[model samples]
Target: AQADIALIGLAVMGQNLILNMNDHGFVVCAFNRTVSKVDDFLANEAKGTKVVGAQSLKEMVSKLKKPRRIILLVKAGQAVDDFIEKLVPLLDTGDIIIDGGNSEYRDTTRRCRDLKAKGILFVGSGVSGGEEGARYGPSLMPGGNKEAWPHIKTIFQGIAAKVGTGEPCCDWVGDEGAGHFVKMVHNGIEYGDMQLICEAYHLMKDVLGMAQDEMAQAFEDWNKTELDSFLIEITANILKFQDTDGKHLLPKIRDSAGQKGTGKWTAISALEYGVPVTLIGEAVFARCLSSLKDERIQASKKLKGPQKFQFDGDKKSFLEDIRKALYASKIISYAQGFMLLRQAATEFGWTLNYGGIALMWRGGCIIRSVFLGKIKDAFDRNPELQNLLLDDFFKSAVENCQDSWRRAVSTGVQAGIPMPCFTTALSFYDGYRHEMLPASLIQAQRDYFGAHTYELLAKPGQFIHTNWTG
Candidate 1:
């Protein structure tokens, strides 16, 4: 019998998703570049299910039902193009090809157009929630060719993570790479969330001199409120967990941080669009600085921090301040992420569903949180919202929290603890609230030095350049 769908790439993600689809009652055919992995998966994980194996792309295409649906979980770049080149000959004109990798959005956009010329329905779908989420359910963001969605919707949604309301965390994101674009922002916000939490933890452990148990408990308590998230839960668990030697493990680990480029990509995209994605930018930079372990170690010894510092003030209210700071920074990060999406929509000419993006992230992704439900409500309340900070709920949330937020960053500043995301978020908030800034002086300096021209507040649309030595 023909299979309902075929997936290329027998990595963990591919194998698990095959089982997920099989569980949802779709017969799945699995394939990989290496022929042996196909049999290994069929013999083990896919054993009793309706999932079968294929040794070649031809066999996989032959086994699939009409309109041959294929999901590629291969590595992002050239491999995706190679497979499409090979599959095109065997696939009929209307057959569908889905790239379910963490590909760059521009690549997805180009592939969408390229494949359309050949009559193949191409999709760039972003699958998040990591390994376990794939085995169970993942937040699926599929876009590119709209023609493919109706044919694949049932299976896609069936295998997708669901929110509390029973709606699947899968949607038809707008055309031409919007899915990957949104997922990129999703990961960027994830970077910000994690860095903010780390800063909060650093404040608690280093500055406040809290024990691991105390820090863990603090995170546990915060998880019950606005800072509730997968990252926070794991951070709490990571903090208190003891190594095999019976010492807490986090301190034993290296201070250096690692990244997979998604965060940097988001930061670069923000710069390209001129959006103030401060928290994510700072988070990525923090990772970069962390990677200079030797330099930091030398600087640590040579560069003296604050001469003398201890928590001489109230610790209880300060803890409250840290929590508020974390929550407020989180709000700022999401606000910045959505605004990036907003500007990209106008520039790229894509009709993105902001509420749907929020809803999808509310469940299965790394940044999944109860806070995203509030974001969804914000967009649903007013689709034309220019910025998330302008939403009434978020406006009041930030307004109510700024005092504590300031104190939190102030503590970090005074104690010599580096809180990049926290400090950046606070600055972003303050700058957004500023009616006037020193940019006029900057423009004047630029015009003075280079005659680059400056705009006057008095004459809005006109550019003026003045000779300074008058």
Candidate 2:
């Protein structure tokens, strides 16, 4: 029988997704560049499943039904391009190709344009949830050629994660690179969340000198509150884990952090869009800083930090403040990320449904959280909301969190503990909420140095030059 769809690339992600499709009653034709990989998968993972192993791309394409659909799960860059190039000659008009790797959105845009001219539909779909999410269900963001959506929507939705709303965590994320762009920002937000969680853990462990179990308990408790998230829940479980020697597993792990550049891409996109995704930018920088292990060790010997410091305040009260700060910072991170998406949508001429995006994120994605439900509701309330901070719900929440946020940031600063996301998020919130800023001085400095004229407050958009030096 002709397969329901064809999946190229038989790595871990591809293997799991094929199984997921088979479980959902779709006959999936799976392929790999190396015939051995295909044979091995057929012998093990694909055994007894409704998945057909193909030796090459041609064989897989041949096995698919009319209006053929193929999913590319190879490496992000040149690999995706090469695979598509090889498949183009064999594919007929109206055939669809889905790029499911974390390819850059611009590449998706280019592929869509190039393939459209050749009478082929190209989709850049972002599949998230890692290895585990794949075998079960993952959040799917599909976009590119609009005409191809109806043809593949059933299969995408069939294998997507379902939330409490009974909505599939899959949707049409707009056109030409929108899906990949959203996925990139999603990864960027994940980085920010991870850094914020680590900073909270760092404070509890280093400043308050809390034990692993105590920290684990704190995280578990936090997961029950508004701060609840997949990252926090996993952090709780990770803290509770122990080595065979009965040693805490976390402390023994390396301090260095590794990244695959999604966070950096988000930062760059934010700059291009002229939007401030500061928390995400700082998150990427924090990872880079963490990567400098040798330099840090050298600096530890020569560079002195604030002399041994301690927190003498009420421990319970301070812990509550930490929670408040973490939650507030998390809001700022999402606000910044969504803001970037909003600007990008306008710039790219894509109509983005902000509420739908948040809804799709609430289940299988790493950044999935109760907080996202609030974000979705905020957008539902005001679909044109300029920023998440402007929403009444989030505004009130941030207002209530202000005192605690300040206290927590001050505590970290006074103790000389590095709180990059927390502090940056706080500063972003402060700047965002302010009506007046020191930008007048900056404008004056720019005008004085480079003759770049400043705009009058009364007459915005009219650049004025003054002969102050004369």
Candidate 3:
């Protein structure tokens, strides 16, 4: 019998996705480097299941029909490249390949171009929504040659999760690497958004001395409001977990965050593209700080804090202040994320279906849920919403939170709690809220160090600067 789809790298997520495909009436032949894993999968199958396992890459390719579809779910960097090299020889022209790793977008662009010349199809697809998302449904972002869209759309739509209203959670994002590119930035923004929430966790428990249930109740309540999103829901769940020691796990933990390289890749790409992303940068930095765990231990032994805050000023007012502050800051962080996507869409000439994009994200991706629904609505209401910060609805939601943001940052500083995301949000809000800026000093500083060209505010786009004198 002719085999249908073939998936390599039978890791946990890949196995689950393949199983998911089989459940949806699609047959899949899978391969893994470890032959034992293939045997394990075969043994687990009920005799008539649609999935069969293969022992080698070549054997896996030989069973599939011409114009095949192969997916890679291996590690991102060299592992993906190595698989491409190994598989290219086995695949025939007109065969299609899909990469589902968190790869840098530039690499995707290059690989797609390279394969297209041989009349083969290459798709840089961004699959999010974790392991659970993989089995149930993932939000899919497929980008590459327009010619391949018709061929791949069916399979993607079939496997992808639907929104609560049952809309398909997949879309053609852009040519060549744009899907992965957008996903990269999404992870970066997600990092910042998460860090902001952790900061809120710190403020509420450490500064305000709230009980565990209080934190859980706060997050759960927010989820029902405009702040409804996946991260917030998960955070609420996390706060509800009781420790054996009866301590609040969320607040008692150290200021350390872990990350894969995609967040760093997003920040690096933003720098290359000359995009301003303070929150994303801080997110990357926060993870870097996390990696310095041993160093932090040594530093803390030597350094000291002013030791505490006097929340004695107003009890009810302080907790309320932190709550509103976090809400406002999160908006700025998400605004920066969308601005990056808007720039890519314009530069690449991609007609991104804003509502469709939001709907897909509502189900599968890490940042999925009702918050994205609102984002989708904002986009539908104003197709020209360059940034969420610029959206009128967001502007109204943030106005009440503005004062809270200031108060929260002040409390954090007084209490010696770190608040990178909060500060960035405030700075972004203040920057856009104003009509005038004193960038002349910035221009002078840039010219002094890098001799990079600068534009005058008085005459936009004309380069002018003062001479540097030692």
Candidate 4:
């Protein structure tokens, strides 16, 4: 009855998070596997902090109130589930279980449903921000039963990152698994946006042969404009630093690209629902290609000269063109993420705050951007806006910078840089520009052979193709 909130697991995130709560005047009941680590945290922590180290799962459960409020910070999949299994017997009806791990949303949904049958409420809470973020404030996504909101909102908002006007970065994304679902989309879009910037770096360094300092200056200048974001801004910082070997890291050798599976999972989920996430898929594949270390290096040696372009026109025109293209690509990537969010919101029946989502990501998260500022506005003003392009700002950007997008794709294609993301955005732009596409012909063939039905162009319904030659 004494404890306000309980967090199980004193991992790095858990430790720092407790410290953060202590600093911010919240007394948290913290638990960890090893009591020694908990002691370490307790010693360094500020005054007024209460950490109840649970040697066993039941003791941790016993420390909280009858209708318990617990935030589980543990591994994904079965690890946390095992902990839950050990602890659930001790919990009473109407107790709350919040999972702050990076578990898959599908798993979160399944777990929540299963627990709800027994009168236990499970919250799939997403927590982000490295060690430091945990120590201060991190972006949180906690979605579950609405009944839990009135009960648990204070703690989450109290300990979460704040946006403009002092609003908590932590929002009730949706019910049951909606929080994890949105987090999945967050990481998936992060994958696309990250790889796109890397592709830009590859073009800037390998194709154009620009030095790190020059690239940094270029990105720094861009950072001052609408292109301002956490990723590009930090990339400029990285360019200024040197590697351990004293060599500029910009030209570093082929280090294998590694992934944590959320991005791929997001793409697979999109496919299951028939949402078009060509850019996200392309980014996943691009990472896969990076993993092919030996083959890529070998292929590089055998490859011919890169098809190059010379800029002889107006100087400002060229820079503006490239900047606009980057901005457009960035918007399309965010659109892909939000589309997934929208679909998931419908499925889970959560009234998502689209503007708040953008505002939250404008800082702290991997996909932060000033562009998100505009997105928040677009959604705030007309939450019913159809797509990114429908926004006047994005439309003007398209009208001005589409030529640069075209040139970048053309150059990538000619030079053999597998720029799937850039090309896909171009395809999206061009495809939407026309009411019809040649892809319908391919669909027609599918219908002829497989007897699959297509949609009607003129009528407001599905279309069917009849094979008459049979």
Candidate 5:
């Protein structure tokens, strides 16, 4: 029988995804650039499955059924375009091309437009969850060429993660690039979550002088609360893990961090859309700063911080404060991410449903958490809700925790710990709530130097100019 779908690029992600499809009873034609790798995959990784391996692009297309669904798991950028160029000649007009890479949304838009002109359908889909998630289930965000979704939905949804309520974490995000755009912001929020967790860990280690086991226990405890999430659970596991030589694995690891550019793309898009996603932006900057380990070490001798301050506060109350701080900051991070998504929807003309987006992230993806349900509820209550902070549930939650949030950040500042994500999240919250800002002074400075006009608060939107020299 002809395969239901064909997947190109046999990297681990590609191979596992094909296996997942096969598990869902979809006959998948799998191919790789290296013929030997294809044979090896079928013989070893895909053994006992109806996964057919192809030697060439021509053979791969031929093995697929009519109105072929081709999933591209290749590298982003040039590799994707090159592969599409090679495959287009071998396929019919109605065949579909599904890009399952972390490609930039604009590139996906261009590909969708070009492919449509030829009567071919193109889908830019985002698959999240690492290799293990690929082999089992992952969050799937698909948008682009609306015509193509119906043909692939059954198979795609079957392989996606299902929440406790049996809802699939896969959906048609929107028109061109919306799927990837959502995924990009999802990654940016992931970065924020990770950095905030690390800062908590740092505070626990440095300020409280907690042992590894104690910190691990604290993370485990947090996972049982509202802050429970995939990242927190894994961090607990990571902290508790011991290497073969009976030493903690974390300390042996380097302080420097690396990135794959999705977070940077999210930050750039936020700036382009004029959205203030400060938490995610600070998370990206933290990674950049972490990469300068050598410089940080060299400057350590030249620069001195306040002699490490001792925490005289109650330890139990302080840990609880840290937990509250994390939860509140996480709320801000999601608020910022969803705000950016909302702005992009208007700018790109995509009918993005914020509630649906939150539901889609409830499982499989890195940021999956119970908190997402509240976000869904917030949007469900008022589809036109301007910001998450304005939602009743979130507003109440933030109000209850605002005091602890302030205490946590102030403690970190006094102790000389750099809580970038946490502090920035608080600043964003404060800035967003205030009706008036110090921007009038900024406007005055600008008008004094360049004669740029200012708007009177009393007569809003009426521009007025003043001569400071006179």
Candidate 6:
């Protein structure tokens, strides 16, 4: 093909991404459903760039070199199928269709299977990073039809974000739907990280009565440590923003928050896999609880919180404790996330690159952090590492911070602050470390009531039932 690649959908992201390719010396044929957008782009952003405008899909395919490559930046769902249907017929065998959307993994799996039989290569790619990242190299997770990688690697990696080692953030994830599944886990962790930070904000705001400046400074300081990340850096900026009336804008905003996709998907998958992704579960539920705006207002008037108490405490030490708690909880959140990933990979027979996934998230994406570099280090040391908690770095880090983490959570509990993600993270950690829990008594109760079998420690895997009346 004369054109290295062609891209449809000329929205802001599409425009920037195509331009990114053009900057790397790729001649791009731009097409859109409207068709006028193609010319509009050519006249403006495409000006002085090696991008051609396609008035027709046939013309676009005709202009491409053999084994045509077309990437659809369209919306997810039926629209993706619609574009695939439109493109699949215009090209010969061995041509490629790339869906660069937040599509459900199963849909990607189906498309990959269906397209392969028709002699077409299909890829479901997860394109992360916001608008700016799209324009300036985003993390690209490409899966499905590994044969297509040899054709597109240059342009994909060329336009993808690069780390200090000069390796690009773009890589082959695994077989069908693995790319999107990894992306979903990344999104789920993003939600947990943000909610954990929010809980810290509440503890500071309601309990310590810190001002916005103080809180902003605290978050800024965190960006230099293990908590250092894109989200944390941007959070400091967001907290520093002020209103026209010269007051902090955060307080003026409503208490209830909004969420979409990914977080809920991770939670659902956790339930499916029986992995205790407790932090993400709590994070998603916290959003749901926040959505009860009217109900909360009514309850605020009718119900009561802990009465005002004489609790003068060291804000500075407690601030450090909160930081420790935030960092510690973040570890568990990732542990739980990776647990889900491992279960899904094993269950679905996907050959997931655990360390490579961490490398991708180390840059470009929202959760980009120096911490993920550590994750890759751990995985590199032991590719078959069972749990992140089993890694020496994470284990020692969590161990050293446990006391301060407990202090922070206990402080919030006594102060009536709702730190769901924080509290649940601690609960998960404690449960994981415990040799035995109180569930044996529940088994006894069940046996007494329903003649349900219980396993004794002495007998181990043997199921035993006792008749209470006998």
TM-score of every candidate: 0.95, 0.93, 0.86, 0.90, 0.93, 0.94
State the lDDT of candidate 5 residue by residue for 1-470, as single tens digits: 37999998899999889999998998999887678888899889888999998899888888888889999998998999998899888889899999999998999989998999988899998888889888899888888988987888888889988877887888788888689988888889889999999999988987888888789999999999889898999999999999998788999899988755568878888899999999988989999898999999998989988785788988888899999999999999999998999898888788876887887788788888989988988988888887998988888888878899999899999999899998999999989988998888999999999989898888997899998897
TM-score of 6: 0.94
| Residue 437 CA displacement from its true place in model 5, Å | 0.9
Cα error, residue 184 of model 3, in Å, equals: 1.2
Give, for candidate 6, the lowest lDDT window spanning 10 residues.
304-313
- Which ten residues in a row are the worst by lDDT in model 2? 257-266
Task: Give the per-residue lDDT of model 1 (tens digit) for 1-470.
Answer: 47999999999888889889998899999999999998888888887889888888888888988888999999999999999999999999999999999999999999999999999999999999888999889999998999998998989999999888888998888889899999999888888988888888888888878899889989999999887788989988998899898889888889899855567989999999999898999999999888999998999788998977767778788889899888999999999998899888889899888998998888889889989989989989888899888989999998878999998888789889999899888888889889999888998999999999988798888998898988
CA error at residue 118 for candidate 5, angstroms: 2.6
| Candidate 4: tens digits of C-alpha lDDT, residues 313-394 | 4544545555666777877877777887877777766677777777666655777776777888888888876677788877
Instruction: List model 3 lDDT by residue over 1-470, tens digit each.
Output: 36778887777789878888888877788887677888777667424687877888888887776668888888888888788888888888778889988787878988989989978789988888888889879888888776778877877888999887767888887787788887787778778778877888888877878888888898898778766777888898888887788765765777666756567777776777667778888878888878888898998999998664477767567767877887788778778777777777777676665666666667787777676777888988877777887777788878888877798898788888888889988987788778877776777788888888688667887886556775
lDDT string for model 2 (9-61, tens) is: 88999999999999999999888877788888887977888888788777788
When 4 and 6 are scored with lDDT, the better candidate is 6
lDDT, candidate 2, at 432: 86
lDDT of model 2 at position 162: 88
* Number of the predicted model whose TM-score against the real structure is largest: 1
Candidate number with the higher TM-score (2 or 3) = 2
After superposing candidate 2 on the true structure, give the runs of residues whose Cα lies further than 4 Å from its correct spot: 53-59, 259-261, 305-310
Worst 10-residue stretch by lDDT in candidate 1?
255-264
> What C-alpha lDDT does candidate 1 achieve relative to the native structure?
0.89
Q: Assess candidate 3 and give its TM-score to the true structure.
A: 0.86
Q: Tell me how far the alpha carbon of residue 158 in candidate 3 is from the true structure, in angstroms, after superposition.
A: 2.1
